[PDB]
Amino acid sequence: QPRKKRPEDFKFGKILGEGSFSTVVLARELATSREYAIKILEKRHIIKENKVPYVTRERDVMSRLDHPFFVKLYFTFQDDEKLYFGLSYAKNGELLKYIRKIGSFDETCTRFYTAEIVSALEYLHGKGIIHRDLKPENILLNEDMHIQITDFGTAKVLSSFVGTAQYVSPELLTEKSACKSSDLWALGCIIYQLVAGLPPFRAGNEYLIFQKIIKLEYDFPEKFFPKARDLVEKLLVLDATKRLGCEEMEGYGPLKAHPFFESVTWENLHQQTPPKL
Ligand SMILES: CCNc1cc(-c2ccc3c(N)[nH]nc3c2)nc(N)n1
Numbered sequence: 084q085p086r087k088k089r090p091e092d093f094k095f096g097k098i099l100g101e102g103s104f105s106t107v108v109l110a111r112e113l114a115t116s117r118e119y120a121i122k123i124l125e126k127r128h129i130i131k132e133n134k135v136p137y138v139t140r141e142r143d144v145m146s147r148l149d150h151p152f153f154v155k156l157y158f159t160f161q162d163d164e165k166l167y168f169g170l171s172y173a174k175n176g177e178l179l180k181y182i183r184k185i186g187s188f189d190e191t192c193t194r195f196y197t198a199e200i201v202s203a204l205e206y207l208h209g210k211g212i213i214h215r216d217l218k219p220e221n222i223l224l225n226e227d228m229h230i231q232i233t234d235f236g237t238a239k240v241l242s243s244f245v246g247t248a249q250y251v252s253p254e255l256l257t258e259k260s261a262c263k264s265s266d267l268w269a270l271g272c273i274i275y276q277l278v279a280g281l282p283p284f285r286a287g288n289e290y291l292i293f294q295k296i297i298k299l300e301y302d303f304p305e306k307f308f309p310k311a312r313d314l315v316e317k318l319l320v321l322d323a324t325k326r327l328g329c330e331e332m333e334g335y336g337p338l339k340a341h342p343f344f345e346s347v348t349w350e351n352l353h354q355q356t357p358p359k360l
């Protein structure tokens with residue numbers, strides 16, 4: 084392994100993302116002219132807020148990941164006040180930006196991108212890892228328009244916390260307990276949102292959003308692709324042991340075999356040419 088990289092190795096540029104405890108900044112390494120997305124975390128603030136476990140878990144998780152549909156951790160370093168993580172640079176930014184830009188996806192685009200998300204989840208779940216906060220903001224688009232999922236501090240590695248309100252599963256609001264199915268719940272929401280242009284549970288505030296979730300209070304627009312609707316209904320199920328794709332439903336085989344995915348070749352998605360948006 085090379086000697087530890089340092090801030091002076093980079094020409095920093097624009098801000099790519101902002102969070103409570105971190106900022107992501109585009110940086111060009113000078114020796115290589117390579118673009119990384121460098122996640123910068125201020126030690127003092129992290130310690131002051133008891134986030135050390137989350138930072139730790141993100142670093143450890145993103146190291147165990149080796150797959151085209153996941154943002155990669157290339158390196159780390161620190162100076163006196165800050166931690167730096169060198170991450171894949173997803174040139175095209177958030178899936179959310181495209182949902183907003185074009186409104187809603189047609190069937191072909193919805194099918195391809197849902198399949199990539201599914202295939203990524205299958206990989207993540209095979210390593211015993213749960214994202215716990217999957218959402219279109221976390222789902223980045225590479226320069227070639229394939230997905231790269233990021234943001235893993237809130238992940239759990241299988242042998243407390245609440246993600247974004249509209250993607251939260253009922254079992255979180257009723258038990259403080261999660262599992263792979265929580266990721267599948269969020270997948271159901273993301274599919275709905277690709278198709279309809281909006282997340283299925285919307286309300287004036289978080290409390291109300293939570294109410295609708297535990298009540299399964301949402302419904303399909305009339306233009307919704309039927310096969311996608313059937314898939315979403317097999318995902319947005321209050322009982323987590325009955326969500327298509329989870330272990331009690333015998334996993335990813337039956338999920339991938341869903342009629343909505345009829346025309347999909349699962350084996351080499353990352354090699355396929357994403358449909359034009
Ligand atoms: C501040 C939000 N928290 C985050 C943000 C990102 C992130 C954001 C944008 C990115 C891009 N355009 N390429 N790579 C990126 C990584 N990644 C993690 N892990 N956590």
